[PDB]
């Protein structure tokens, strides 16, 4: 299909959509949609007592990927920073102390790239790399 559209299996040329957040803890995002059009923007805001790290405003690109970096609302109380949840992914594990771990899976047909499991190390850094749920097309 042309740029910004993806086909039915193999080869209807449907429009690409970027994935919505499964959750955005201790903050909100606007507009709140089930998926986002190419060129659409999502803006993130944190509640009181939280630090917004990552990109406050992100745009959906023609290959169905968001630009910028995963936004997260961090209270700074963990041994490691809040690792966030990249858009399209679901995470399990909500403790960010030394030795704790989180696990990530993607949703629908999204292909996980990066570390599906990450541990909070001694120097305050999460092990591995951030998982990114890529579109199967492109």
């Amino acid at each position, epitope marked *: 299909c042309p740029q910004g559209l993806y086909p039915s299996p193999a080869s209807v040329c449907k429009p690409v959509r970027c994935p919505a957040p499964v959750s955005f803890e201790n903050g909100i995002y606007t*507009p709140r949609l*089930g998926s986002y*059009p190419v060129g659409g923007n999502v803006s993130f805001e944190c509640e009181d007592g939280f630090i917004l790290r990552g990109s406050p405003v992100r745009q959906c690109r023609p290959n169905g990927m968001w630009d910028g970096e995963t936004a997260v609302c961090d209270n700074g109380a963990g041994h490691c920073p809040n690792p966030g949840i990249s858009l399209g992914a679901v995470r399990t594990g909500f403790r960010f102390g030394h030795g704790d771990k989180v696990r990530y899976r993607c949703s629908s047909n999204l292909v996980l790239t990066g570390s599906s499991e990450r541990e909070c190390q001694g120097n305050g850094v999460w092990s591995g790399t951030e998982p990114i749920c890529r579109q199967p097309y492109s």
Partner: antibody
Amino acid sequence: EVQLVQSGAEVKKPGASVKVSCKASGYTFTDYNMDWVRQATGQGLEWIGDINPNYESTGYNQKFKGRATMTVDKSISTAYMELSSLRSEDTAVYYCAREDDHDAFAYWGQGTLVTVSS
Amino acid sequence: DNVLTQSPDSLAVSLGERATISCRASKSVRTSGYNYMHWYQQKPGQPPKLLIYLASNLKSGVPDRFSGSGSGTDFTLTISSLQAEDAATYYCQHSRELPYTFGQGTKLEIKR
């Protein structure tokens, strides 16, 4: 084009539960959340909650106090709203409503009357 | 929660004349360069119908005698030339945060 078709009217006793269905057609179901909104007679519109079919993740109006449960069945493009511990004040017309890319409710179901009474 | 207050609660307008309805939000609905306020029309026995999105944009198929304006917290819906089919209740709604909330509704009737 896009159509949202709800289940029929219900009558329930106080303390009971009701489950309303909303079948969607004419678009890719997983592109959009499904929302639920209610209206008592001669009264205003109240948002209940939403569900994202991609994740089955939900958001709720806190005023309902966990009494509302939203689910989907993607295989048949249907969303459900279950409201438990019903009170007579829950008597209303219940709508499913679907956002557009501006987060406005561009599409609505026809409404389902739920009457809660002894 | 954001409270939307519409005024007047009802109004009678002669056919052909201008009708204006106001919506005031207790919190700003503006963020990221857009005003997340939408307007709907509702007639008896029917769901609401979306007329105006993001304060001032007409939905396709809506006659251009309808228009919207405002920013921040104060918004207006105008019908430049009231026609008989425009008698209805109008509602504003924000999509700035959760919960989504609606104004209480303004009933527009025909003056005689």
